[PDB]
Amino acid sequence: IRIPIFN
Amino acid sequence: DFSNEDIYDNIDPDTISFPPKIATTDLFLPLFFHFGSTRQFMDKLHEVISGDYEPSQAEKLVQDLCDETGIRKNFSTSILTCLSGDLMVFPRYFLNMFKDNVNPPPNVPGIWTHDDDESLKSNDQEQIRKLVKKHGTGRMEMRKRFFEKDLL
């Protein structure tokens, strides 16, 4: 998946 | 630290009969239906999303959400996309989906709907005002960057 993730 | 969005995160899971009507087998795997309550599912979800994920590890996260919580990979991917990758809004997504019996939840800060994305690209002052009232400026700017980079 190209959607970058974060908190 | 404080935010009036906390009302979307603090929905009492014990008020949500399990499994919820909206939680169908096209969205969830058999493991999900083996949780004993909404609270048990939410607490496992918290444990998964509290793990160490680098920005490039959406695939590992999606695999862990499948293996540990029974969320189908295509559904986790769709959720991650509408959250602009903000893992902290995952619990909010499920609590509101389950309480409202609607997927996606249509009026929740941090959860971008199709209508919201159309308002973003509309160039209309009124639609942008309503949109920033829902999500805030910071989220709106992130969403625009996603569109600019051809991530959506």
Swiss-Prot record, chain A:
Subcellular location, record wording: Nucleus; Chromosome, Telomere
Domain of life: Eukaryota
Function: Negatively regulates telomere length by preventing telomere elongation or promoting degradation of the telomere ends. Recruited to telomeres by interaction with the C-terminus of RAP1, which binds directly to telomeric repeat DNA. This may create a negative feedback loop in which the addition of new telomere repeats creates binding sites for inhibitors of telomere length extension. May also influence the balance of transcriptional silencing at telomeres and the silent mating type locus HMR, which is mediated by SIR (Silent Information Regulator) proteins including SIR3 and SIR4.
Quaternary data: Interacts with RAP1 (via C-terminus). Interacts with RIF2.
Family as reported in the entry's similarity comment: Belongs to the RIF1 family.
Protein's name in the database: Telomere length regulator protein RIF1
Source organism: Saccharomyces cerevisiae (strain ATCC 204508 / S288c)
First-to-last residue of the parent protein present: 1760 to 1766 of 1916
Swiss-Prot record, chain B:
Intracellular or extracellular location(s): Nucleus; Chromosome, Telomere
Regions crossing the membrane: none
Residues the record lists as Phosphoserine modifications: 56
Function: Essential regulatory protein in yeast whose DNA-binding sites are found at three types of chromosomal elements: promoters, silencers, and telomeres. RAP1 is also involved in the regulation of telomere structure, where its binding sites are found within the terminal poly[C(1-3)A] sequences. The opposite regulatory functions of RAP1 are not intrinsic to its binding sites but, instead, result from interactions with different factors at promoters and silencers. RAP1 mediates repression of the HM loci and telomeres by recruiting the SIR complex.
Family: Belongs to the RAP1 family.
Binding partners and assembly: Interacts (via C-terminus) with RIF1. Interacts (via C-terminus) with SIR3. Interacts (via C-terminus) with SIR4. Interacts with a GCR1 homodimer.
Additional information: Present with 4390 molecules/cell in log phase SD medium.
UniProt-recorded name of the protein: DNA-binding protein RAP1
Native source organism of the sequence: Saccharomyces cerevisiae (strain ATCC 204508 / S288c) (Baker's yeast)
Part of the intact protein present: 676 to 827 of 827
